[PDB]
Design a protein around this ligand. Structure first.
Ligand SMILES: CC(=O)[C@H]1CC[C@H]2[C@@H]3CCC4=CC(=O)CC[C@]4(C)[C@H]3CC[C@]12C
Length: 251
């Protein structure tokens, strides 16, 4: 009725919650924790690719572009999802990685990892502050998938532009569901798109921590599964070096 068709479709294709398959019964060490988060990441990566095959318009981009967009955005999509689950299930007061892997301050012993968690915590915090709706979150997540492209652009750049515009228009409709004011809705659009822009710097810290841990994996006793190892090796160094074009809503 009032909920736009595309938004209902996005709600319908959102994956079912993913479990980390984490022990719990045993004392979590820093390395065991990271290993468990990587196992969760491997399971979420599969989920992300399956989700993308049902995402309107995505399957129509050139296959190389589809692969490139997933390899550029997996970290962003996953931390954004973490933000949403944390917001929804624990009022943003704990990091809800999975139902069997919820982290609070007490479990973040490692000072470097705790610092990374505080960075991640910024998202649920903004979600709480802005009171982001399920409808807004769904459209913003798609925009994140489409938020970075190669320096030379995509093979299906035209199709990509149209897709991105369609989802920007859908985010506007989501905002309109609760933002009556023409300026209030406008200021809302500004706030939400500014949040997406800010994710770029946030994700960069996650990318750096990941690539470092990946290179020191044997030394840190941290295991990375095969699919995650592939995306890291295929693009992280390039992304970190800034050899990609981040798309920004605000100059
Ligand atoms: C092991 C490691 O370096 C950590 C640092 C940042 C961590 C990621 C942070 C974001 C994230 C959220 C999830 O819900 C799944 C796991 C992932 C994808 C995490 C997997 C483990 C990572 C990559």
């Amino acid at each position: 009725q009032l909920i736009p068709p595309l938004i209902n479709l996005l709600m319908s294709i959102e994956p079912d919650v993913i479990y980390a398959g984490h022990d719990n019964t045993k004392p979590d060490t820093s390395s065991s924790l990271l290993t468990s988060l990587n196992q969760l990441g491997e399971r979420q990566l599969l989920s992300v690719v399956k989700w993308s095959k049902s995402l309107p318009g995505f399957r129509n981009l050139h296959i190389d572009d589809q692969i490139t967009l997933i390899q550029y955005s997996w970290m962003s999509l996953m931390v954004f999802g973490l933000g949403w689950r944390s917001y929804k299930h624990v009022s943003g007061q704990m990091l809800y990685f999975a139902p069997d892997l919820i982290l609070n301050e007490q479990r973040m012993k490692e000072s470097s990892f705790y610092s990374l968690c505080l960075t991640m915590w910024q998202i649920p915090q903004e979600f709480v502050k802005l009171q982001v709706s399920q409808e807004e979150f769904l459209c913003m997540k798609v925009l994140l998938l489409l938020n970075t492209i190669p320096l030379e652009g995509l093979r299906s750049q035209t199709q990509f532009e149209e897709m991105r515009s369609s989802y920007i228009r859908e985010l506007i409709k989501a905002i309109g569901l609760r933002q009556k004011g023409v300026v209030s809705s406008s200021q809302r659009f500004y706030q939400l798109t500014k949040l997406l822009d800010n994710l770029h710097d946030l994700v960069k810290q996650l990318h750096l921590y990941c690539l470092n841990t990946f290179i020191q994996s044997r030394a840190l006793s941290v295991e990375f599964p095969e699919m995650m190892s592939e995306v890291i090796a295929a693009q992280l160094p390039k992304i970190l070096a800034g050899m990609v074009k981040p798309l920004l809503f605000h100059k």
